[PDB]
Amino acid sequence: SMHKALTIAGSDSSGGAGIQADLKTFQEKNVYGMTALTVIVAMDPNNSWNHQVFPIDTDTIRAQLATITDGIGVDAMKTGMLPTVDIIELAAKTIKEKQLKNVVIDPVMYPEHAQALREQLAPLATVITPNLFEASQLSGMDELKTVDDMIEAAKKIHALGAQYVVITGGGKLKHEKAVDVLYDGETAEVLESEMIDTPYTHGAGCTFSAAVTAELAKGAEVKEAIYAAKEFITAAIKESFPLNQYVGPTKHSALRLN
Q: Which of residues 48-107 bind its own copies (CB under 8 A)?
A: 49, 52, 54, 56-57, 60, 63-64, 66-68, 70-72
Residue 163: contacted member of its own copies, ligand ADP, none (CB under 5 to 8 Å, by partner type)? none
Which of 180, 182, 213, 247 forms a contact with ligand ADP (CB under 6 A)?
180
- Cα end-to-end span (Å), the chain: 26
Q: Least distance (Å) from its own copies to the CB of residue 78?
A: 15
Residue 71, Cα to own-chain centre: how many angstroms?
25
CB 191 within 8 A of CB 230: yes
Cα(64)–Cα(174) distance, integer angstroms: 41
Cα(58)–Cα(84) distance, integer angstroms: 9
Residue 45: contacted member of ligand ADP, its own copies, none (CB under 5 to 8 Å, by partner type)? its own copies
Q: Least distance (Å) from its own copies to the CB of residue 206?
A: 14
169 marked among binding-site residues: yes
Q: Least distance (Å) from ligand ADP to the CB of residue 99?
A: 28
Task: Count the neighbouring beta carbons within 10 Å of the beta carbon of residue 45.
Answer: 10
Nearer to its own copies, 34 or 166 (CB): 34
Q: Least distance (Å) from its own copies to the CB of residue 175?
A: 27
List the one residue out of 8, 150, 163, 162 whose CA is nearest residue 77.
8
Q: Is the dihedral of CA 187, 190, 116, 22 positive or negative?
A: negative
CA distances from 98 to 30, 94, 110, 162 (A): 24, 6, 28, 18
228-248-231 Cα angle (round to 5): 10
Cα(104)–Cα(125) distance, integer angstroms: 6
Task: Build a one-symbol-per-residue string for 203-232: x at contacts with ligand ADP by CB under 6 A, - elsewhere.
Answer: -xx--x---------------------x--
Strands 3-12 and 31-44: parallel
Q: Which of residues 139-178 bind ligand ADP (CB under 6 A)?
A: 168-172, 178
| 222 binds its own copies per the rule CB under 8 A | no
Which of 37, 43, 147, 195 forms a contact with ligand ADP (CB under 6 A)?
195
CB 68 within 8 A of CB 34: yes
**HSE of 192 in the Cβ direction (CA atoms, 13 Å)?**
5
Residue 11: contacted member of ligand ADP, its own copies, none (CB under 5 to 8 Å, by partner type)? its own copies
> What residue numbers does the annotated binding site for Mg(2+) cover?
134
The residue ranges that bind ligand ADP (CB under 6 A) are: 131, 168-172, 178, 180, 193, 195-196, 198, 201, 204-205, 208, 230, 233-234, 237
The residue ranges that bind its own copies (CB under 8 A) are: 1-2, 4, 11, 13-15, 19-20, 23-24, 27-28, 30, 32-37, 40, 42-46, 49, 52, 54, 56-57, 60, 63-64, 66-68, 70-72, 239, 241, 243-244, 246, 249, 251-253, 257
